[PDB]
Amino acid sequence: KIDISKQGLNSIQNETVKLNLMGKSKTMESKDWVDPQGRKGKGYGVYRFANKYGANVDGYSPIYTPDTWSESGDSYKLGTKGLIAWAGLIVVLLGVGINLVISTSAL
Amino acid sequence: ESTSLWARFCEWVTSTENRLYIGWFGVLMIPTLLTATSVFIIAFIAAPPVDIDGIREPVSGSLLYGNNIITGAIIPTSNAIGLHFYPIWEAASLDEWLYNGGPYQLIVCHFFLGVCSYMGREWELSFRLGMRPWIAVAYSAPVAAATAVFIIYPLGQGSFSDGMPLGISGTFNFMIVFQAEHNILMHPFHMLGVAGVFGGSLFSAMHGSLVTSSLIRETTENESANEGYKFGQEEETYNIVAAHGYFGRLIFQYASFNNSRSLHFFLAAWPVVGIWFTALGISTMAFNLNGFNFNQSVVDSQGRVINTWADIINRANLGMEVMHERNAHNFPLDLA
Amino acid sequence: GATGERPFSDILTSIRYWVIHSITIPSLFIAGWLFVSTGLAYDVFGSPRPNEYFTEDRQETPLITDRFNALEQVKKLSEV
Amino acid sequence: GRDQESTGFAWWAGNARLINLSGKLLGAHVAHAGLIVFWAGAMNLFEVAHFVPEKPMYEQGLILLPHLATLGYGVGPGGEVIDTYPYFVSGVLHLISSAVLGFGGVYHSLVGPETLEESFPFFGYVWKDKNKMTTILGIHLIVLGLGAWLLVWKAMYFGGIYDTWAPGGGDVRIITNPTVSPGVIFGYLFRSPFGGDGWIVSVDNMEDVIGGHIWIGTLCIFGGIWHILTKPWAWARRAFVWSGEAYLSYSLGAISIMGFTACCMAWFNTTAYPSEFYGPTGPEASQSQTFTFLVRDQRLGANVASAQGPTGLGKYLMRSPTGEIIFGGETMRFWDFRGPWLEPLRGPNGLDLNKLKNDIQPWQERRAAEYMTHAPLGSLNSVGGVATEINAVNYVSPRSWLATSHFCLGFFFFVGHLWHAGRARAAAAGFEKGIDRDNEPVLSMRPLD
Amino acid sequence: KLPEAYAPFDPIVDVLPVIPVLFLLLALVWQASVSFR
Amino acid sequence: KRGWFDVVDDWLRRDRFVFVGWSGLLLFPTAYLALGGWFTGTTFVTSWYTHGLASSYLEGCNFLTAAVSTPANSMGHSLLFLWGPEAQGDFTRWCQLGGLWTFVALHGSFSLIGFMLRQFEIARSVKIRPYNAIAFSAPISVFVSVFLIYPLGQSGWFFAPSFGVAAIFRFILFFQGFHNWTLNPFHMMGVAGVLGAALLCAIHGATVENTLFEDGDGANTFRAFNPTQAEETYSMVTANRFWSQIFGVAFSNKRWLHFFMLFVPVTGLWMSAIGVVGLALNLRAYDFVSQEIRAAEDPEFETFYTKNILLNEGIRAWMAAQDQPHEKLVFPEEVLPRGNAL
Amino acid sequence: KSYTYPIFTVRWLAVHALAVPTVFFLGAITAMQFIQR
Numbered sequence A: 001k002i003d004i005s006k007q008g009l010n011s012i013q014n015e016t017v018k019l020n021l022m023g024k025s026k027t028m029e030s031k032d033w034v035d036p037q038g039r040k041g042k043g044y045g046v047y048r049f050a051n052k053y054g055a056n057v058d059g060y061s062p063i064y065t066p067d068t069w070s071e072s073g074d075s076y077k078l079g080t081k082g083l084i085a086w087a088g089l090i091v092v093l094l095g096v097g098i099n100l101v102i103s104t105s106a107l
Numbered sequence B: 001e002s003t004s005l006w007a008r009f010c011e012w013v014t015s016t017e018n019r020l021y022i023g024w025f026g027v028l029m030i031p032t033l034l035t036a037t038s039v040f041i042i043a044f045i046a047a048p049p050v051d052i053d054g055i056r057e058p059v060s061g062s063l064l065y066g067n068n069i070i071t072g073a074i075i076p077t078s079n080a081i082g083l084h085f086y087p088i089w090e091a092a093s094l095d096e097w098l099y100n101g102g103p104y105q106l107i108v109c110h111f112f113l114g115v116c117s118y119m120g121r122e123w124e125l126s127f128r129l130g131m132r133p134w135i136a137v138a139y140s141a142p143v144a145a146a147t148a149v150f151i152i153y154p155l156g157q158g159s160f161s162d163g164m165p166l167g168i169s170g171t172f173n174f175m176i177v178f179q180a181e182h183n184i185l186m187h188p189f190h191m192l193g194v195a196g197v198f199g200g201s202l203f204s205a206m207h208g209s210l211v212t213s214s215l216i217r218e219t220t221e222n223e224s225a226n227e228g229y230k231f232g233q234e235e236e237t238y239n240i241v242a243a244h245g246y247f248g249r250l251i252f253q254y255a256s257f258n259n260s261r262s263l264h265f266f267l268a269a270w271p272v273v274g275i276w277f278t279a280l281g282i283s284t285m286a287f288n289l290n291g292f293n294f295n296q297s298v299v300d301s302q303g304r305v306i307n308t309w310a311d312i313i314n315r316a317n318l319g320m321e322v323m324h325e326r327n328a329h330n331f332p333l334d335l336a
Numbered sequence C: 001g002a003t004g005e006r007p008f009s010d011i012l013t014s015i016r017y018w019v020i021h022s023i024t025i026p027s028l029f030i031a032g033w034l035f036v037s038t039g040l041a042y043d044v045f046g047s048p049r050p051n052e053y054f055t056e057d058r059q060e061t062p063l064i065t066d067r068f069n070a071l072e073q074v075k076k077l078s079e080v
Numbered sequence D: 001g002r003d004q005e006s007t008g009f010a011w012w013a014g015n016a017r018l019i020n021l022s023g024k025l026l027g028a029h030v031a032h033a034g035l036i037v038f039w040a041g042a043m044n045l046f047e048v049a050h051f052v053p054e055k056p057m058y059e060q061g062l063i064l065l066p067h068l069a070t071l072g073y074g075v076g077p078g079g080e081v082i083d084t085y086p087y088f089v090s091g092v093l094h095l096i097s098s099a100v101l102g103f104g105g106v107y108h109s110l111v112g113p114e115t116l117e118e119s120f121p122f123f124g125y126v127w128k129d130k131n132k133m134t135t136i137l138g139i140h141l142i143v144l145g146l147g148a149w150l151l152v153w154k155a156m157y158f159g160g161i162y163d164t165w166a167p168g169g170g171d172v173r174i175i176t177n178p179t180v181s182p183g184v185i186f187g188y189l190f191r192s193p194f195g196g197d198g199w200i201v202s203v204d205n206m207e208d209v210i211g212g213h214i215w216i217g218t219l220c221i222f223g224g225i226w227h228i229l230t231k232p233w234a235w236a237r238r239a240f241v242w243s244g245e246a247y248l249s250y251s252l253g254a255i256s257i258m259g260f261t262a263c264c265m266a267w268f269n270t271t272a273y274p275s276e277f278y279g280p281t282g283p284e285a286s287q288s289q290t291f292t293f294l295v296r297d298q299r300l301g302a303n304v305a306s307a308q309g310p311t312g313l314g315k316y317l318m319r320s321p322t323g324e325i326i327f328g329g330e331t332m333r334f335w336d337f338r339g340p341w342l343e344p345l346r347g348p349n350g351l352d353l354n355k356l357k358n359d360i361q362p363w364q365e366r367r368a369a370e371y372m373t374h375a376p377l378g379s380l381n382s383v384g385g386v387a388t389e390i391n392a393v394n395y396v397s398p399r400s401w402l403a404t405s406h407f408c409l410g411f412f413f414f415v416g417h418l419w420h421a422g423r424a425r426a427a428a429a430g431f432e433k434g435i436d437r438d439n440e441p442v443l444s445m446r447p448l449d
Numbered sequence E: 001k002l003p004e005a006y007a008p009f010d011p012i013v014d015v016l017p018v019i020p021v022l023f024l025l026l027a028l029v030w031q032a033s034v035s036f037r
Numbered sequence F: 001k002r003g004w005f006d007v008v009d010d011w012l013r014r015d016r017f018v019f020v021g022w023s024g025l026l027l028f029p030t031a032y033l034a035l036g037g038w039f040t041g042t043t044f045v046t047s048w049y050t051h052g053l054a055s056s057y058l059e060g061c062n063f064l065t066a067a068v069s070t071p072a073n074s075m076g077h078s079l080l081f082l083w084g085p086e087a088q089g090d091f092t093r094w095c096q097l098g099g100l101w102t103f104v105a106l107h108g109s110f111s112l113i114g115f116m117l118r119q120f121e122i123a124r125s126v127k128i129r130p131y132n133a134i135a136f137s138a139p140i141s142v143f144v145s146v147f148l149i150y151p152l153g154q155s156g157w158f159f160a161p162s163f164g165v166a167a168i169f170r171f172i173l174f175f176q177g178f179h180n181w182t183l184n185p186f187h188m189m190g191v192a193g194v195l196g197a198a199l200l201c202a203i204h205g206a207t208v209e210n211t212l213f214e215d216g217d218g219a220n221t222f223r224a225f226n227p228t229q230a231e232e233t234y235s236m237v238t239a240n241r242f243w244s245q246i247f248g249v250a251f252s253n254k255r256w257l258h259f260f261m262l263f264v265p266v267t268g269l270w271m272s273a274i275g276v277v278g279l280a281l282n283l284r285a286y287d288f289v290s291q292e293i294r295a296a297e298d299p300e301f302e303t304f305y306t307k308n309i310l311l312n313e314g315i316r317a318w319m320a321a322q323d324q325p326h327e328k329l330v331f332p333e334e335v336l337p338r339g340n341a342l
Numbered sequence G: 001k002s003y004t005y006p007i008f009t010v011r012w013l014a015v016h017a018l019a020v021p022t023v024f025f026l027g028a029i030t031a032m033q034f035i036q037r
């Protein structure tokens, strides 16, 4: 019912984090998998009815989908000149603010 | 087939076919609880007046001695005894035993042992039925609260007379004297406990209303939906997705719980932590670590005092402090 | 899914967002500091400064007794 | 590290991923020990730097310095601090050793061997191997016994420990004749916990403390030797759950009991916790108040013995429920108190009327007044006095801090023991992850009535 | 107080005991940087 | 959709991050104004001229002791508009006279009305039943009876709760000292309802979380669920058997379970509201006449009820002088009730 | 695919109406801490 590829989780660099966000783990479906305490697995995986319902709750309602992120915003259009102007403005504003705070107080 | 007497007894005690589970913790639980119940009923109905303050001023608490249900109580042990063990066989006679406040100590000890065994038996049946053993951990919060009000506070105050009476008006008196002496309302742990109970009521109503609002139609209008649910059925009887959609449009999408397991864990965790913290606050205040004292904190330029709601609360505390025991004090400081 | 707005994770990790908001938040903080320090807070909402709690006329707490002359009574009580 | 993909444990339960990793677990434990030593050293340095000599120890919010004072370090007759250099030495040594411990922990956690069962067979273990676990338990029992004997040697040969009951005022004595009588040692252990008895909290001389420490050191060494050479019997294999979480739950329960005992000892004891460095106890302040009011009213020409209160019981002196002469008022509940400044005025049948009528000393009066004014009452923001007082005094007793903190810790570790014992018992059986839909145990039982 | 030879280093001592709490916060920060895998 | 109503309804009932709806026009402005009024009153506005205290951060109060104070008792039950015959359009003197309390209360009541309307509207848009909207009636009744009906039956707004922490604590202590509120059966039902609701929440959470099903291989059981699944995630049969053998009785109906969960706190709060409505006219269950007569005739009869009566008397006598400045009570130190040596 | 989102929405106003006065009041309260009686 749920297509994992259409959930917008394909733009994640870390493979382990990507598998975590879809509620999937290739290691756990193996019949010889043993968790830290030492209990064998029954082959269910993360979710027993993963095939019946498509995916898990993690793969149903994700809260971090880089695919839906805006194409812009990963690069600043104003470039280096904008950053230089911002640096000048923030230095000037910090100086003005500290001067106003000192002047209006009782020294 | 069991043959030995002990093997048969163990099989019967640890049986899951009994109407009420006995277990090995129930072996301790049943007699102590029955003893405390019997003594409580008999003392609540027909017990003589008890000298609670040790100043030869008996206080009546029995129905047969002119009391109703709201007024009746079981008066704590005498102040003269203190923290000393006062079993029934340490008295010259039952008349002397009833005059000093023995039944309170008896009931308190048996009740403490019984509630500890009750929590143990909860774990035991969880293990025998194949469940996960944390309903007993949930019960630890009321167990700790009862222990704090019945054991730890007398332990830190040096007498069982400062313990909570086994009555209604006695409970109110305990609360008022506790406020007058420790300023419990200003304690952050009491604030956390109040938040715990208020949030528990909020979330109980919220969950009940959300589940009742998403019932799938399986009946007609001349019968209740409870008849629409069938015991032991396999399919879910309400729409979790519909309830989540309603709540996420009520506040916003990422505030509701899409996971039923996570939602029920949150429901379990909130009040339990709240009650844990309020019991810890009572136990801490037993050793005289009171709440915030913002008295005469706001001071103007010339040094005079500007009052505050904290100062009004202090005036009320002073009012209920000079009267909590009229004749039991000979010296100006209540150091106990 | 999504209701048709930019994700909060996308916005909060933007150079444009942190360039715009490296000015607005400190500007508001400084504006509040100047509002308090310049004495505007006392004058706008009528709160007493530490030296104005008691005047030379009355050395007790104020008390308002008239409902319809309340404006004039509170004007008289606040006199410095 | 690891991740939920290959472990099944989330980040909030990430320390459970190193249950079967011996090297990383050892690194974590060593790092934690380094943290403990670091806190000890840093707190000692913080307290030594903020100490003024014009005020007593309990008036400045110190909790680690009174521990060194009771060992006879930098203190003099009467309980007055003379030298403050040994405290600095102890703090510096702890802080420096914490660096070595932390480096060892970091090494063993980051780049050390991950599982030391193939390269270091002596240090390797399996949680289900009973013999190895018992051997480790025996080794650590021997270490603890050596520590107890190290404490014993201090009170005998290396200058002794502070004794608050010493003749001519409290002073650093040397314990030459410890009490090693089996009847005395067993009397404290199997005593009732109620009033008057007090269990082990009622130890009232340093000879008993040193004798009990001799006993505990010998017992720990013998038990360690016994466990190194043996393995659990059938009746022990039949009763316990054998896994790391089970062992953790056992330890949690033991240390919860220890925390409750420490809280009670801090609140009630006066021998191992002298009032000169910790301030008066609960009962001590009330007894001091009654004593000083009796002294003042006697100085004004009054008959304290025959004075009658509003209730007709006695304003200053009355009789305990067993007959002993005790102080009157609401302090009649604290008649079990026994302190160095009050014992000299007490006879075989209680307080001696002639002694407190003609032989009361100014030092006793000063101690009573000081312990009356510094009562262990306060608020959360450190305001001394009852809850209906004003903001004048910045004081909370060191007994209150220790008692409250350690009761909270003991309760939380009891809850932790419950959690871990339940989880271990369930996981060993094999249903800690839920019920099996295919084979549900309840569906196979006959229905109830 | 500290000995006269250790007087200049008093400000260092006054901030030491918060380091364990900083260690707990640092563990949380490391988990966040690892992205809670 | 061509009409004005149709296009306005299309825009208002849109799918959005924050749902506005037709009830938003009443909810959002009033709620925003109430929140802003409370924050402004706690941060800048004082309480010197109406109560004789300091109730702001500007004057040196923390989060606990800061509040928005009620008007003076001379103002009676005046609604105290900014343009009314008392403030007469002066904002500073309106703030000084205590008009921010009535502002906050009057906007908060309409915000509550708007919130219930929003619940109704959202429930109808999603095509479910309005039981969540029905459940809000208990908080609304509590607010109405405590903040409006009780002051409306008293001397004025001066005896209403003030929007603060320590102010609410003073209100509670006043209710104990003067009304004997702890001895009211309606308050007893309210306490029972609140505590039972907390009990139900904790017990249901624990029982569901400890009767789960094995739907995965990991120890973290939160990841073995899917909201669109059909089968239930926990064993109702196992839960019922456990609670039948432990307690004696247990639930066998999920719908009845959850309706009981809804029913308990609502009934408790409604009963407490009825009690406060009764108390608004000083109709207090204060004393037992038989006990008073017996204690008067026999100087040896004493119960905990008489001790509570004495405590209430002390509270009244020692709080009256400062809590009610309008009465101008001057009490010599020898008329205040007092115990021995305390 | 390319995703384009509006800058100013109802959510923008809802966020800012609670964010701007919060920062202003926090600055005022911080200034309040250094006033001497």
Ligand SMILES: CCCCCCCCCCCCCCCCCC(=O)OC[C@H](CO[C@@H]1O[C@H](CO[C@H]2O[C@H](CO)[C@H](O)[C@H](O)[C@H]2O)[C@H](O)[C@H](O)[C@H]1O)OC(=O)CCCCCCCCCCCCCCCCC
Pocket: B083, B108, B109, B110, B112, B113, B116, B143, B144, B147, B151, B155, D192, D193, D194, D195, D196, D197, D198, D199, D200, D201, D202, D203, D204, D205, D260, D261, D264, D265, D268, D269, D270, D271, D336, D337, D338, D339, D411, D414
């Ligand atoms: C083997 C299993 C147990 C067998 C026995 C079980 C009995 C159960 C009976 C039922 C009631 C419950 C227990 C009540 C305990 C009351 C303790 C008390 O009145 O007092 C406690 C005593 C203190 O004893 C005091 O000891 C004092 C010591 O005397 C002397 O002490 C000094 C000696 O130098 C000074 O000289 C001093 O002046 C002098 O008085 C005095 O004697 C006091 O009168 C005396 O009361 O402490 C101690 O025994 C030390 C610590 C005891 C354990 C911890 C207690 C606190 C925790 C409670 C339980 C856990 C709660 C939290 C979890 C809740 C959920 C599960």
Ligand code: CLA
Pocket: F025, F026, F029, F030, F033, F079, F080, F081, F082, F083, F099, F102, F103, F104, F106, F107, F110
């Ligand atoms: C969204 C709805 C809303 C609502 C329901 C309220 C409700 C209330 N406000 Mg709030 N208020 C709001 C938004 C709202 N406010 C806004 C946006 C602001 C701007 C910041 C304020 C600012 C404010 C102030 C400054 C005060 C209040 C106060 C009050 C009360 C006003 C009493 C009054 O007589 O009203 C007016 C009476 C009515 C019945 C109006 C309805 C008349 C109908 C529409 C007929 C129209 C006919 C008319 C002859 C022709 C006009 C049309 C033509 C001009 C175009 C009332 C509790 C007062 C207060 O709380 O005192 C303690 C007060 O002091 N409010």
Ligand code: CLA
Pocket: D001, D002, D003, D010, D011, D012, D013, D014, D015, D016, D017, D018, D021, D024, D025, D027, D028, D029, D031, D032, D099, D102, D103, D106, D109, D110, E024, E027, E028, E030, E031
């Ligand atoms: C009491 C302290 C404490 C300690 C000693 C440990 C110890 C350990 N943790 Mg646990 N943990 C803790 C608290 C602690 N944890 C808390 C509070 C949480 C919840 C956030 C976790 C959650 C957690 C997870 C989720 C995981 C671990 C794992 C690990 C182990 C592997 C370390 C590693 O791979 O990453 C170390 C990573 C880094 C390279 C960061 C290095 C930073 C260094 C160590 C800081 C200390 C340096 C100090 C400033 C200077 C010392 C130098 C000396 C000369 C003075 C390690 C033994 C991992 C595991 O399970 O292994 C199988 C893992 O998966 N832990």
Ligand code: CLA
Pocket: D141, D185, D186, D189, D219, D220, D222, D223, D224, D226, D227, D230, D231, D232, D233, D236
């Ligand atoms: C660090 C603490 C410590 C721990 C955790 C253990 C743990 C264990 N011990 Mg060891 N042991 C220790 C120290 C310790 N021991 C010491 C110091 C000694 C010397 C006395 C012994 C001597 C010892 C013996 C002789 C035996 C064990 C056995 C066992 C196992 C059974 C568990 C059990 O106690 O039953 C649960 C406990 C009980 C049912 C009741 C015990 C409580 C006693 C009776 C209280 C009264 C104390 C007693 C009379 C001693 C006198 C008091 C003192 C003043 C002299 C378990 C592995 C058994 C075994 O498997 O050996 C291989 C066994 O037979 N231990």
Ligand SMILES: CCCCCCCCCCCCCCCC(=O)OC[C@H](COP(=O)(O)OC[C@@H](O)CO)OC(=O)CCCCCCCCCCCCCCC
Pocket: B020, B226, B227, F246, F247, F248, F249, F250, F251, F252, F253, F256
């Ligand atoms: C050894 C055992 C130790 C613990 C013993 C506990 C004993 C108490 C048990 C009480 C059961 C009473 C239930 C009645 C009603 C009844 O028959 O319940 C049975 C009911 C059955 O539920 P079903 O799912 O079968 O209902 C189906 C629907 O169609 C109903 O319409 O279950 C519950 O509601 C559980 C809630 C009980 C809540 C009871 C709390 C305590 C009540 C107050 C006690 C006052 C004491 C006063 C003394 C003076």
Ligand SMILES: CC1=C(/C=C/C(C)=C/C=C/C(C)=C/C=C/C=C(C)/C=C/C=C(C)/C=C/C2=C(C)CCCC2(C)C)C(C)(C)CCC1
Pocket: D031, D032, D034, D035, D038, D045, D092, D095, D096, D098, D099, D101, D102, D103, D105, D106, D109, E006, E009, E012, E013, E023, E024, E026, E027, E030
């Ligand atoms: C692994 C891990 C972890 C942990 C860690 C730890 C726990 C560590 C520790 C560590 C440590 C624990 C360390 C320590 C260090 C120390 C040092 C480095 C010291 C120094 C010192 C000094 C330098 C001194 C000086 C002086 C002197 C000599 C004298 C006086 C003065 C003074 C003080 C100045 C965590 C959590 C992160 C997580 C991940 C993993």
Ligand SMILES: CC1=C(/C=C/C(C)=C/C=C/C(C)=C/C=C/C=C(C)/C=C/C=C(C)/C=C/C2=C(C)CCCC2(C)C)C(C)(C)CCC1
Pocket: D184, D185, D188, D189, D200, D203, D208, D209, D211, D212, D213, D215, D216, D239
């Ligand atoms: C130093 C000192 C001293 C001494 C001490 C001692 C010598 C001690 C000992 C101690 C001891 C010697 C202890 C012991 C304990 C024990 C215990 C605590 C036990 C427990 C047990 C248990 C818990 C069990 C359980 C069970 C059962 C019952 C059934 C089956 C199962 C099981 C096994 C689990 C004195 C006081 C003189 C003085 C001061 C100082």
Ligand SMILES: CC1=C(/C=C/C(C)=C/C=C/C(C)=C/C=C/C=C(C)/C=C/C=C(C)/C=C/C2=C(C)CCCC2(C)C)C(C)(C)CCC1
Pocket: F032, F033, F035, F036, F037, F039, F040, G017, G018, G021, G022, G023, G025, G026
């Ligand atoms: C009055 C009035 C008005 C209005 C106004 C408004 C609307 C305002 C608003 C305002 C606002 C809107 C404000 C706000 C504020 C806020 C704040 C001040 C906050 C604070 C916060 C805090 C302090 C936090 C804390 C914390 C932390 C840090 C941690 C965790 C927990 C918590 C979260 C608690 C008008 C003109 C129209 C008209 C006339 C009257």
Ligand SMILES: CC/C=C/C/C=C\C/C=C\CCCCCCCC(=O)O
Pocket: B002, B008, B009, B011, B012
């Ligand atoms: C005080 C009155 C109470 C009495 C209850 C006491 C005992 C209960 C009766 C019998 C105990 C169990 C005997 C063995 C039953 C059969 C066990 C089996 O064969 O499995």
Ligand code: OEX
Pocket: B053, B079, B157, B161, B162, B177, B181, B324, B325, B328, B334, B335, B336, D330
């Ligand atoms: O007894 Mn019951 O309350 Ca404990 O404080 Mn003191 O004593 Mn009596 O007064 Mn307060």
Ligand SMILES: [Cl-]
Pocket: B328, B329, B330, B331, D328, D329, D330, D331
């Ligand atoms: Cl007294």
Ligand SMILES: [Fe+2]
Pocket: B207, B211, F204, F208
């Ligand atoms: Fe539910």
